Amino acid sequence: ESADLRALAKHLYDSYIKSFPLTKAKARAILTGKTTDKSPFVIYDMNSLMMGEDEVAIRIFQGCQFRSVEAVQEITEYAKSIPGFVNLDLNDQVTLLKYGVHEIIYTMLASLMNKDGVLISEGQGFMTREFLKSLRKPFGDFMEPKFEFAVKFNALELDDSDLAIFIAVIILSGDRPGLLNVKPIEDIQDNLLQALELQLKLNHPESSQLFAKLLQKMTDLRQIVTEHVQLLQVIKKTETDMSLHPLLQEIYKDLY
Ligand SMILES: CN(CCOc1ccc(C[C@@H]2SC(=O)NC2=O)cc1)c1ccccn1
Numbered sequence: 001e002s003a004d005l006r007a008l009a010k011h012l013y014d015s016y017i018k019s020f021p022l023t024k025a026k027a028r029a030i031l032t033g034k035t036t037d038k039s040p041f042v043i044y045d046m047n048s049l050m051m052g053e054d055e056v057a058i059r060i061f062q063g064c065q066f067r068s069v070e071a072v073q074e075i076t077e078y079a080k081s082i083p084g085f086v087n088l089d090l091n092d093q094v095t096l097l098k099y100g101v102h103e104i105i106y107t108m109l110a111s112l113m114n115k116d117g118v119l120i121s122e123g124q125g126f127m128t129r130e131f132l133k134s135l136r137k138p139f140g141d142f143m144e145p146k147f148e149f150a151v152k153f154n155a156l157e158l159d160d161s162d163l164a165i166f167i168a169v170i171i172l173s174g175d176r177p178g179l180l181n182v183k184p185i186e187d188i189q190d191n192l193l194q195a196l197e198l199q200l201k202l203n204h205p206e207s208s209q210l211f212a213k214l215l216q217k218m219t220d221l222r223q224i225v226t227e228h229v230q231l232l233q234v235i236k237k238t239e240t241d242m243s244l245h246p247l248l249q250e251i252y253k254d255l256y
């Protein structure tokens with residue numbers, strides 16, 4: 001079955017590529033100017049944000065919400081390919097996605113980030129970290145957590161084929177609140193974890209406890225969504241007509 005684990009890994013990686021238009025590999029190549037045809041427009045202030053055309057703190061923040069809505073779709077398409085998943089009780093299919101998508105959004109957002117800022121609009125634009133730190137309270141600090149994490153995370157130097165398995169492990173969490181049949185979920189994850197363990201062994205031989213160090217990052221991931229939600233609350237207490245995209249509403253409904 002170690003051959004399965006390999007085939008499982010290749011499978012996940014193919015669907016991941018099928019499901020997500022902008023990979024870490026492609027993102028890294030835009031972030032480091034492997035190109036002409038590929039360099040981004042840089043939004044670093046209010047003007048260039050205006051001229052950024054391939055209230056503002058509000059525009060950007062809903063911009064972030066439209067990205068999530070797209071992300072949820074892609075992640076969902078990807079989940080479909082995880083062997084076992086569509087066989088779960090669909091109440092559980094639903095729960096796993098609900099508690100899963102943000103952890104995956106932020107994992108993959110890391111792929112799009114460096115110390116200075118984050119890629120946007122399929123890597124066509126690049127928004128600077130200072131610029132985002134410069135929105136007015138409470139929007140002033142909604143991204144910094146993501147950045148602080150992305151910096152640690154990217155230190156792992158994982159690539160797309162590592163990430164594919166990792167995000168499957170995230171979804172298939174038998175610890176999510178309100179699962180009915182947990183044992184099938186953990187049977188799946190056990191395979192995913194083994195696939196992951198082997199992949200890291202093979203892809204980064206020279207790299208002690210990367211498997212463990214990567215699992216520990218799941219902790220940081222959850223704290224990100226934990227605090228993001230805290231902040232949604234501040235915004236909700238502090239802002240008028242702060243209505244959130246219908247889809248993001250269902251997801252945030254009883255989440256923590
Ligand atoms: C700064 N960027 C990159 C996206 O960066 C993101 C930050 C946070 C999220 C999570 C969203 S925000 C929310 O409240 N709920 C969510 O699911 C999603 C993406 C963008 C992206 C598009 C337009 C403007 N700017």
